[PDB]
Design an enzyme around this catalytic site. Structure first.
Site, PDB file in Angstrom:
ATOM      1  N   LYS G  51     -24.033 -35.904  16.102  1.00 13.46           N
ATOM      2  CA  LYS G  51     -24.444 -35.767  17.475  1.00 13.46           C
ATOM      3  C   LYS G  51     -25.922 -35.972  17.481  1.00 13.46           C
ATOM      4  CE  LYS G  51     -24.359 -32.496  21.338  1.00 13.46           C
ATOM      5  NZ  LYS G  51     -23.918 -31.133  21.737  1.00 13.46           N
TER       6      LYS G  51
ATOM      7  N   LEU H  39     -24.111 -25.935  29.489  1.00 12.18           N
ATOM      8  CA  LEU H  39     -23.016 -26.531  28.729  1.00 12.18           C
ATOM      9  C   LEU H  39     -23.346 -27.938  28.262  1.00 12.18           C
ATOM     10  CD1 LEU H  39     -21.385 -24.075  29.807  1.00 12.18           C
ATOM     11  CD2 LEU H  39     -19.411 -25.617  29.772  1.00 12.18           C
ATOM     12  N   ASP H  40     -22.889 -28.283  27.064  1.00 13.68           N
ATOM     13  CA  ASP H  40     -23.152 -29.607  26.518  1.00 13.68           C
ATOM     14  C   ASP H  40     -22.540 -30.685  27.390  1.00 13.68           C
ATOM     15  OD1 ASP H  40     -23.694 -31.806  24.916  1.00 13.68           O
ATOM     16  OD2 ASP H  40     -22.064 -31.385  23.512  1.00 13.68           O
ATOM     17  N   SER H  41     -23.149 -31.865  27.403  1.00 14.29           N
ATOM     18  CA  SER H  41     -22.576 -32.967  28.153  1.00 14.29           C
ATOM     19  C   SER H  41     -21.170 -33.190  27.645  1.00 14.29           C
ATOM     20  CB  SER H  41     -23.412 -34.231  27.983  1.00 14.29           C
ATOM     21  OG  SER H  41     -24.738 -34.029  28.440  1.00 14.29           O
ATOM     22  N   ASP H  43     -19.201 -31.043  26.750  1.00 17.11           N
ATOM     23  CA  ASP H  43     -18.350 -30.101  27.427  1.00 17.11           C
ATOM     24  C   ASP H  43     -17.949 -30.615  28.774  1.00 17.11           C
ATOM     25  OD1 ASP H  43     -19.287 -28.816  25.246  1.00 17.11           O
ATOM     26  OD2 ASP H  43     -20.307 -27.207  26.334  1.00 17.11           O
TER      27      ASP H  43
END
Ligand SMILES: CCCCCCCCCCCCCCCCCC(=O)OC[C@H](COP(=O)(O)OCCN)OC(=O)CCCCCCCCCCCCCCCCC
Ligand SMILES: CCCCCCCCCCCCCCCCCC(=O)OC[C@H](COP(=O)(O)OCCN)OC(=O)CCCCCCCCCCCCCCCCC
Ligand SMILES: CCCCCCCCCCCCCCCCCC(=O)OC[C@H](COP(=O)(O)OCCN)OC(=O)CCCCCCCCCCCCCCCCC
Ligand SMILES: CCCCCCCCCCCCCCCCCC(=O)OC[C@H](COP(=O)(O)OCCN)OC(=O)CCCCCCCCCCCCCCCCC
Ligand SMILES: CCCCCCCCCCCCCCCCCC(=O)OC[C@H](COP(=O)(O)OCCN)OC(=O)CCCCCCCCCCCCCCCCC
Ligand SMILES: CCCCCCCCCCCCCCCCCC(=O)OC[C@H](COP(=O)(O)OCCN)OC(=O)CCCCCCCCCCCCCCCCC
Ligand SMILES: CCCCCCCCCCC[C@H](O)CC(=O)SCCNC(=O)CCNC(=O)[C@H](O)C(C)(C)COP(=O)(O)O
Lengths: 158, 127, 60, 120, 170, 65, 178, 84, 276, 458
Positions: G51, H39-41, H43
């Site tokens: 990532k 929240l993560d992208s 996510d």
């Protein structure tokens, strides 16, 4: 011809580079994307050679002006859009490669046809002798000639 | 490890297209531009179709350039070459000569048989 | 009940048609035979079909 | 789908008889005297009972009975049951008749092969 | 309908021989059909035919009498030949409904005799060839411009054969 | 008319369950009733003869020679 | 369908749009749920690692080998929802979405009934003609100062003005005409 | 039944309250997934997908790269199925 | 036709095994059963072929309206993948579905049994292609398999349908007809077989393996399929691609013969016959 | 037959003398009745054909047409009341009269005993037609189309003129009755092999054969609806009627001099049928449909078996009615759409519910659905063609599959699919448009009940 000048309609194969860039305007394309159909004199003329991809894989969510042709208003139409319409030929990528498809399908067909042949060579038949019909194999009733009696075909017990 | 293999049909998908992944600045410049042509054309359809006070037929001249190109700009761009006249005679006279020797041979086989007395022509009381 | 309406009214007509046109015209309603069996009487002529033989195979 | 196929296709041959031409040796290959089969029904009885040609077997006679008890006893389609057993049985007794003829032809052809090696 | 042009065999029906206590669901229904479907209709029909018989009228058949044919007819005389191509084009039809009847009489004889058609119905198929071998021998090769002159020739091309073959046999 | 339910087992009407068990139970009554009255699903009721036990006299196998 | 297509795609949207096709093509293979929810949090792991690769070249080399891994490990018959492309119910109720400019040729008898309906319809048509001028002018006064134009259209930016080229996003034939 | 907004509103709220990462006692419509709920992208791809499976339809990619307020989801879903 | 009926029977049945659309699986089964019907006509047994046509109509009609009930009751979900545990949520259709499923698989003493095994044993007893005889029997086991596929995925599994549940099958118009056909599916084979005229002179004399082959192959067909469905629940081998594709995208006859013919037949008109 | 004709002539005085406002109804109402007088010719209770008088005759082949020719004048005048309602009140009365003269001339041509009466009247019909196509033609290219329609017919016509004057010297009268009852048997010379071609070629040209059919696609494209109806329904069939009456003489040569045309037509049937499959102009597709379904006819008027001729007569009357119906509905789309393009205007059933039912029935007539005279016709030509050579089914078998495809494609991409977003809003259907259709199909339903009347001479 409401509002259509000859120069707003197609023309001849763009010979000089300025003509290739003039046509690209007519067709609302980018001058570096207008790739005239090959000049072999079969009529294409200056009509752009647009990618041969069917309307099937045009993004199915975008609000295409002409919804069902999945074509916007103004975008150069493809020469064969009468064939690549959603109701006809598809050119939509397939999870299995095309060759792999053609070989596999026909392989199946052949193996089957062949095996069916192995079959006719070696049939399956129970241990039963031939069925026996009465009279002379029903000669008269199979519609045989009443006058001419047939060579008696007799069937004996056991 | 089978690699998808685009054929003229079953073409290379968007993904799995090497070109798409890596593109030069120029390429982006193109795309960023092609949208412009489309956006321009889009904002020339969208405020003429959404125009109150309009009864005239939105024309879609891109379709009029297509039909003219396909039925009235053909013969003005015809030049008789080879690969065009050889292929322009095999198509008009090829089968037309094929079937003649298909129908003559059948019609002649039939006639002979009728003449010699073999064709049954039974219960055929019509024609 | 209305049921009778479009079951009875259509019927009378059909019958009118089948018993007074078809029946009347030649070869319009043809049957097969009645599958007479040995020992069963023929109503129209009066004959009694002769019985079969007395096969005694049994052994079922 | 019996073992008869194995014996003929696979392994041996010229012994297992050919399905066609099963009756191939003289009706008496050592069969001293054999009364020809007997057909109970008259050619007409059948023609009057409109039995399908195929169904005109040597069991045609028990069939006509079934059909009789099926027209009679009409509203009751579950009561001509003894008649069906009979027909079927008659059909088996000839099914086995056919089975016996095939086995006899098998064995006889073997006789030929056995006799063959007596030769030389 | 003439029982003789459209024949029809006498009927033989097995008699009722019920062997079950249950009541036949057919006999009851018919007893109704005969009352609620037939009687009502029967009544109307009669009343039709009496309305007819009051002013009973008649219609005849228009007998066409014979007239000189082609072989009697002069060449080029359009009058006589016209009268004689009609006399034939007329018999081209009378000789065609005859063949319509054998097409029909047979069809019935294979519905009336199923599973026996192979045999019982051979009185007509022998005739369907006795009539087809003839229709084939006077009217078949001809074009759509069928004319008596051409049947005159279709025949006479073959009357040579029934005379060349015969002579040939010698 | 019934009421929509969220993440719960839809309530069931008397009739839905009884009719469903009715059709299935009759299926089983019929299969059992016929099996008892007519068990010719297996064996038919005619036994296959052993084609290999037919005395050579039975088939006309002449005494070799 | 609503928002306009971006010209080129970023790296992210290409990666993050695989996370969808992938996970959604993993729920055709894992017909059950517990198996799926398992085999999928294992998928994220694959995307979760790699990532923070800062080496673009590498990142576009993990992406290019991800979408080929995927193409060869995809389900032929995935689970595509109804009302979505290809799958059923997509254009089902489009036979009943007439385009609303057709109620203008109705016989005065037909429109006689349904009276208040046309009283409100005539109001909205007054709204549409009352702003075409302020709209098109807006569309133009705010026109691009460059050839770079995206299909995005401007909001209202003033009271009373109706956010532009709106007559067909509002007044759209209802989805389920039924 | 047809989907009333104040319901669709609660339904989208609810599902999130079942996502472990998103606090159940803070998710508040107008709480941007990424800059608030943090929240993560990656996510958000899933949060949307849950909604696509709660309401049974597909939020297209381009229209769903932006469903980040936990409310945009509530009007976009409603605007999609024509809920007034 | 014995030969082509036979090829369609298995070809269609194998395609049905991996199809994930409920209506599609039933339709392939419609083709597979008619493939068996074609086989009997090919073995010159016309009367029994007609008998299967009548029995085929009752049960196939049931299964399709059964799925009509499931699709309409759910939010128009036509995929077995998102449909589960209909047995507890909707016993009335599930009961009708399994009655129909067993009739399709020729359960003993149900309408399929009276006509279908007559056809099976007919094959096992006639003189026939060996390849045709073997494929028709495994086609019968495949019919049990895909039949098993439908009830396991559609009925006996944890529910996977969308979360709000609104199921109603109480409407008389649903039940009544489904109820009426169910009565036909249960009793029709009994009634039609006894009533029809004696025909075909069947061969009831068989070695017992052949007499009971239809019954056993149907039984292990489900047995093997039930085994495979269980393997799915485990947490392993997410993806499985053993020629699964050939099976899943219709044997590839649709992908290839539908893109080439319509393309080479239209290209020739526009490009060659029309313009040239 | 001067009631089907004199009352017709008098229509011309009525179109001129009548009030500008009432001119349309007087003419249309009166010719409807003119059609009713035409129906009297159908009363043939005997084989002897009806020779009304020396010059005027009506036999089974002409009678089914004379009635159609009289029937379409009402319809033609009803389909052209819209366009041609923008004219100056003297352009109309010219168009109405032009349409009137066509059936006066066509009624006589179909009802003519002397073959050269056919020629003079035959080639006269071009004058009224060329005016209808060129003067009122919408497109820039009608001047061209008119030229093509005049020259292809004219170059064919002068050979027939020489041939018919030639037979008059050889036999001594061009009277169809006598020529039939007289011995005219050609002698298979090289010259006769030319005579035959001279007589048939002029008829083969206006009956588009594969080799010379380019005139018909170009002509119907720019022709006004009334001209396109006349060309498809009555004008093309003039060629077929001629081939039936002229091959009474030249009896021996066509046995072997037909192969060239027969093969040209059957291969032509396939290619003409196929290019319909991808043609963007709807009027273009109907025109090639007309070429293919007329290529079947020249392949039955040449095999010359009773059934062929009967199939031909059935199909010609039937296809005539069907084609017009298709050309008439194509016009209704053209007038609201304002473009001939097939791709635009998608989804009309959604907005014009009934016209779509008429479209569906017209297409089912176009393809061979069975309880229709259209199918009986093809079934019969198919049978004879099979008799000529069993292989013919292959080529007459590729045409049936293609004919199904283009007929339904016209319905699928014009009358189904999503509606076009916002073409000029499509005003509802007039009752005239719908009747003009109903008037075409109600007769198609009635004729199919009793096919015997259009059964041909054979
Ligand atoms: C779609 C149909 C598929 C099935 C088609 C075939 C079905 C069975 C019929 C063919 C086999 C018949 C065998 C029995 C004899 C029949 C009568 C006969 O004698 O046929 C003769 C025919 C002659 O044809 P030819 O090859 O020219 O031979 C010249 C010899 N000096 O020789 C032939 O038999 C010709 C066979 C038919 C060939 C045409 C039909 C299939 C091909 C269509 C092609 C279309 C394009 C034509 C060519 C275009 C390119 C030039
Ligand atoms: C298919 C389209 C419908 C077919 C209708 C067939 C019957 C048409 C008919 O001709 O009926 C009227 C008939 C006329 O009399 P005619 O035919 O001359 O018979 C004289 C007998 N000596 O007979 C009469 O006029 C007598 C009065 C009859 C009135 C009732 C007629 C009802 C006929 C119902 C027949 C139904 C046939 C099946 C239809 C299937 C449709 C798909
Ligand atoms: C040893 C044997 C001993 C005796 C055992 C005898 C058992 C024989 C079988 C009895 C049961 C038969 C049966 O229930 O049939 C169900 C019926 C469908 O049966 P089926 O014969 O297939 O009819 C359809 C067309 N053939 O399906 C139905 O009829 C369902 C109910 C239909 C209700 C119709 C209502 C009509 C009135 C409607 C207005 C109220
Ligand atoms: C048994 C052992 C041997 C096994 C192999 C034997 C050959 C079997 C196949 C023989 C030919 C069958 C017909 C070929 C065309 C089949 C129909 C077809 O392709 O149409 C489907 C096409 C696209 O639809 P589809 O791909 O199904 O996808 C829909 C959902 N996305 O939808 C379309 O509209 C396509 C365009 C249709 C209109 C033009 C089609 C061409 C018309 C003329 C040619 C017709 C086919 C060739 C002539 C007949 C050949 C038999
Ligand atoms: C160019 C178009 C015309 C090409 C040829 C067309 C066909 C021939 C001319 C017209 C038809 C015709 O009547 O020709 C037959 C004529 C001989 O007439 P015929 O009846 O055979 O007399 C024999 C006496 N022993 O034989 C001829 O008339 C030959 C004519 C030769 C010139 C034809 C026209 C050329 C025009 C330039
Ligand atoms: C004339 C040459 C051509 C002229 C074309 C233009 C003419 C227009 C002006 C004249 C219009 C009327 C004259 C033409 C129609 C004539 C109608 C007719 O002749 O009906 C005859 C029929 C009696 O039947 P008949 O054939 O005498 O008995 C047979 C005994 N073997 O009497 C009847 O039964 C009347 C019944 C009326 C309703 C019949 C509806 C039946 C529909 C059946 C087909 C349905 C499906 C059709 C599918 C078509 C698909 C495209
Ligand atoms: C069921 C079908 C199975 C198919 C599964 C598939 O083949 C296997 C697979 O996806 S293999 C995943 C590896 N894919 C990457 O490694 C891309 C990483 N891309 C980045 O790291 C970006 O540079 C960025 C920093 C922007 C990420 O940031 P972001 O949070 O995504 O926005």
């Amino acid at each position: 011809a409401f509002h259509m000048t000859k120069d707003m309609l197609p023309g001849s194969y763009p010979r000089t580079p300025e003509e290739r860039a003039a046509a690209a305007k007519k067709y609302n394309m980018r001058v570096e994307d207008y790739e005239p159909y090959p000049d072999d004199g079969m009529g294409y003329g200056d009509y752009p050679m647009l990618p041969n991809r069917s309307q099937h894989e045009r993004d199915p969510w975008y609000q295409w002006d002409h919804s069902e042709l999945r074509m916007n208003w103004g975008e150069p139409i493809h020469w064969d859009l009468d064939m690549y319409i959603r109701n006809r030929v598809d050119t939509s990528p397939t999870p299995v490669s095309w060759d792999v498809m053609c070989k596999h399908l026909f392989g199946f067909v052949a193996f089957m046809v062949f095996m069916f042949w192995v079959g006719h060579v070696f049939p399956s038949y129970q241990p039963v002798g031939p069925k026996q019909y009465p009279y002379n194999n029903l000669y008269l009733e199979r519609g045989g000639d009443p006058t001419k009696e047939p060579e008696p075909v007799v069937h004996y017990d056991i | 490890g089978s690699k998808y293999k685009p054929a003229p049909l079953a073409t290379l998908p968007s993904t799995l297209d090497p070109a798409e992944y890596d593109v030069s600045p120029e390429t982006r410049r193109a795309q960023v531009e092609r949208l412009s042509i489309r956006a321009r054309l889009k904002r020339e359809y969208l405020l003429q179709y959404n125009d109150p006070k309009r009864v005239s037929h939105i024309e879609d001249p891109a379709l009029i350039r297509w039909t003219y190109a396909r039925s009235a700009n053909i013969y003005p761009n015809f030049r008789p070459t080879p690969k065009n006249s050889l292929l322009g005679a095999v198509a008009g006279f090829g089968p037309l000569i094929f079937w003649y020797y298909v129908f003559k041979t059948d019609r002649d086989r039939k006639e002979r048989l009728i003449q010699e007395g073999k064709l049954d022509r039974k219960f055929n009381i019509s024609y | 009940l209305f049921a009778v309406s479009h079951v009875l009214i259509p019927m009378w007509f059909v019958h009118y048609y089948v018993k007074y046109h078809m029946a009347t015209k030649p070869y319009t309603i043809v049957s097969s035979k009645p599958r007479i069996f040995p020992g069963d009487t023929i109503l129209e002529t009066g004959e009694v079909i002769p019985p079969m033989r007395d096969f005694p195979d049994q052994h079922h | 789908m019996g073992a008869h196929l194995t014996r003929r296709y696979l392994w041996d041959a010229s012994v297992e008889p050919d399905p066609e031409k099963i009756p191939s040796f003289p009706p008496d290959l050592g069969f001293p005297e054999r009364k020809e089969r007997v057909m109970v029904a008259t050619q007409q009885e059948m023609m009057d009972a409109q039995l399908t040609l195929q169904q005109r077997d040597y069991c045609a006679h028990y069939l006509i009975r079934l059909l009789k008890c099926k027209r009679d006893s009409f509203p009751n389609f579950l009561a001509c049951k003894h008649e069906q057993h009979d027909w079927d049985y008659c059909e088996h007794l000839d099914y086995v008749k056919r089975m016996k003829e095939f086995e006899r032809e098998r064995r006889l052809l073997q006789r030929k092969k056995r006799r063959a090696l007596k030769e030389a | 309908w003439d029982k003789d042009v459209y024949p029809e065999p006498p009927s033989r029906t097995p008699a009722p021989s019920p062997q079950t206590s249950l009541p036949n669901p057919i006999t009851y229904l018919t007893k109704a059909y005969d009352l609620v479907v037939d009687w009502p209709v029967t009544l109307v029909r009669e009343f039709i035919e009496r309305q007819h018989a009051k002013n009973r009228t008649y219609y005849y058949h228009r007998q066409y009498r014979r007239v000189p044919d082609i072989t009697e007819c002069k060449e080029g005389d359009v009058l006589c030949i016209y009268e004689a191509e009609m006399q034939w084009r007329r018999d081209f039809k009378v000789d065609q409904e005859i063949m319509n009847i054998i097409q029909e009489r047979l069809k019935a004889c294979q519905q009336r005799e199923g599973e026996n058609y192979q045999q019982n119905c051979a009185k007509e198929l022998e005739q369907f060839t006795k009539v087809t071998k003839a229709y084939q021998d006077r009217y078949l090769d001809l074009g759509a411009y069928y004319s008596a002159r051409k049947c005159l020739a279709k025949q006479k091309q073959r009357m040579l054969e029934e005379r060349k073959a015969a002579r040939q046999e010698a | 008319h019934i009421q929509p339910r969220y993440r719960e087992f839809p309530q069931l009407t008397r009739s839905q369950v009884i009719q469903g068990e009715f059709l299935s139970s009759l299926m089983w009554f019929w299969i059992l009733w016929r099996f008892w009255h007519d068990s010719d699903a297996v064996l038919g009721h005619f036994s296959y003869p052993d084609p290999s036990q037919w005395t050579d006299e039975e088939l006309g196998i002449p005494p070799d020679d | 369908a609503f928002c306009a297509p971006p010209a080129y795609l970023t790296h992210q949207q290409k990666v993050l749009r695989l996370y969808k096709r992938a996970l959604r093509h993993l729920e055709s293979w894992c017909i059950h749920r517990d198996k799926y929810r398992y085999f999928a949090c294992l998928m994220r792991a694959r995307f979760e690692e790699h990532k923070n690769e800062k080496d673009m070249m590498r990142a576009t080399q993990l992406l290019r080998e991800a979408e080929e891994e995927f193409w060869q490990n995809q389900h032929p018959q995935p689970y595509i929802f109804p009302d979505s492309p290809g799958g059923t119910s997509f254009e089902r109720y489009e036979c009943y979405k007439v385009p609303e400019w057709c109620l203008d040729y109705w016989h005065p008898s037909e429109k006689a009934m349904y009276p208040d309906y046309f009283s409100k319809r005539e109001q909205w048509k007054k709204l549409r003609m009352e702003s075409w001028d302020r709209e098109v002018k807006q569309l133009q006064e705010e026109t691009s100062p460059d050839g770079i134009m995206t299909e995005a259209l401007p909001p209202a930016r003033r009271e009373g003005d109706l956010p532009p080229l709106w007559w067909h996003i509002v007044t759209r034939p209802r989805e389920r005409p039924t | 039944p047809p989907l009333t907004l104040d319901g669709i509103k609660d339904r989208v709220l609810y599902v999130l309250k079942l996502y472990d990462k998103i606090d159940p006692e803070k998710l508040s419509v107008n709480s941007h997934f990424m800059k608030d709920l943090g929240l993560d992208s990656l996510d958000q791809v899933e949060i949307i997908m849950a909604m696509e499976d709660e309401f049974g339809f597909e939020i297209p990619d381009i229209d769903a790269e932006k469903l980040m307020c936990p409310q945009e989801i509530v009007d976009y879903i409603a605007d999609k199925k024509d809920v007034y | 036709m014995l030969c082509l009926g036979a090829l369609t029977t298995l070809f269609t049945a194998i395609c049905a095994l991996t199809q994930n659309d409920i209506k599609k699986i039933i339709a392939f089964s419609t083709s597979s059963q008619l493939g068996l019907m074609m086989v009997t006509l090919g073995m010159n047994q016309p009367h029994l072929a007609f008998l299967h046509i009548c029995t085929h109509a009752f049960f196939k009609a049931m299964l399709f309206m059964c799925s009509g009930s499931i699709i309409h009751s759910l939010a128009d979900e036509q995929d077995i993948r998102k449909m589960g545990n209909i047995t507890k949520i909707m016993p009335f259709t599930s009961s009708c579905l399994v009655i129909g499923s067993l009739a399709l698989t020729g359960m003993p003493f149900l309408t399929g049994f009276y006509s279908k095994d007559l056809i099976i044993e007919a094959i096992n007893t006639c003189n026939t292609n060996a390849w045709a005889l073997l494929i028709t029997l495994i086609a019968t086991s495949m019919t049990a398999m895909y039949s098993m596929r439908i009830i396991y995925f559609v009925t006996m599994t944890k529910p996977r349908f969308p979360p709000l549940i609104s199921i109603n099958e109480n409407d008389p118009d649903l039940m009544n007809p489904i109820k009426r056909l169910a009565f036909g599916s249960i009793f029709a084979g009994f009634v039609i077989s006894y009533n029809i005229p004696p025909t075909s002179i069947p061969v009831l004399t068989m070695p017992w393996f052949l007499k009971t082959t239809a019954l056993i192959i149907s039984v292990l067909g489900f047995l093997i399929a039930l085994e495979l469905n269980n393997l799915t629940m485990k947490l392993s081998m997410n993806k499985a691609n053993p020629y699964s594709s050939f099976s899943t995208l219709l044997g590839f006859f649709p992908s290839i013969i539908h893109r080439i013919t319509p393309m080479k037949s239209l290209n020739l008109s526009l490009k060659t016959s029309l313009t040239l | 037959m001067l009631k089907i004709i004199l009352p017709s002539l008098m229509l011309l005085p009525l179109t001129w003398l009548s009030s500008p406002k009432k001119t349309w109804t007087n003419v249309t109402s009166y010719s409807f009745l003119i059609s009713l007088t035409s129906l009297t010719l159908l009363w043939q209770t005997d084989e002897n054909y009806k020779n009304f008088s020396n010059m005027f005759s009506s036999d089974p082949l002409s009678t089914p047409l004379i009635i159609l020719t009289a029937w379409l004048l009402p319809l033609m005048l009803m389909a052209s009341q819209n366009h041609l309602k923008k004219d100056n009140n003297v352009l109309q009365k010219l168009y109405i009269s032009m349409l009137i003269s066509l059936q006066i001339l066509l009624i006589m041509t179909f009802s003519a005993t002397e073959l050269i009466m056919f020629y003079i009247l035959f080639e006269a019909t071009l004058i009224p037609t060329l005016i209808i196509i060129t003067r009122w033609g919408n497109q820039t290219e009608r001047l061209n189309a008119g030229i093509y329609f005049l020259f292809y017919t004219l170059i064919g016509s002068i050979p027939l003129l020489i041939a018919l004057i030639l037979i008059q010297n050889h036999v001594g009268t061009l009277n169809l009755m006598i020529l039939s009852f007289t011995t005219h048997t050609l002698d298979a010379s090289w010259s006769n092999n030319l005579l035959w071609l001279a007589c048939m070629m002029a008829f083969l040209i206006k009956m588009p054969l594969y080799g010379v059919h380019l005139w018909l696609p170009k002509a119907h494209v720019e022709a006004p609806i009334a001209g396109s109806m006349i060309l498809a329904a009555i004008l093309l069939k003039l060629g077929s009627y001629g081939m039936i009456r002229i091959s009474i003489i030249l009896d021996p040569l066509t046995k072997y001099m037909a192969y060239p045309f027969i093969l040209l037509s059957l291969w032509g049937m396939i290619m003409t049928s196929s290019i319909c499959l991808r043609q963007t102009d709807l009027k273009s597709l109907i025109a090639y449909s007309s070429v293919s379904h007329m290529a079947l006819v020249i392949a039955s008027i040449m095999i010359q078996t009773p059934w062929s001729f009967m199939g031909a007569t059935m199909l010609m009357i039937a296809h005539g009615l069907t084609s017009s119906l298709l050309f008439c509905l194509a016009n209704s789309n053209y007038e609201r759409i304002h473009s001939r393009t097939m791709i635009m205007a998608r989804g009309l059933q959604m907005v014009f519910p009934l016209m779509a039912t008429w479209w569906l029935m017209a297409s089912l007539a176009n393809l061979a659905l069975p309880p229709s005279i259209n199918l009986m016709g093809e079934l019969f030509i198919t049978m004879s063609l099979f008799s000529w050579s069993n292989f013919t089914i292959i080529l007459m078998g590729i045409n049936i599959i293609i004919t199904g495809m283009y007929s339904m494609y016209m319905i699928i991409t014009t009358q189904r699919g999503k509606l076009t977003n916002h073409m000029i809003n499509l005003q509802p259907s007039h009752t005239r448009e719908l009747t003009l259709m109903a008037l075409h199909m109600i007769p198609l339903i009635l004729l199919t009940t009793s096919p015997k009347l259009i059964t041909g001479l054979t």
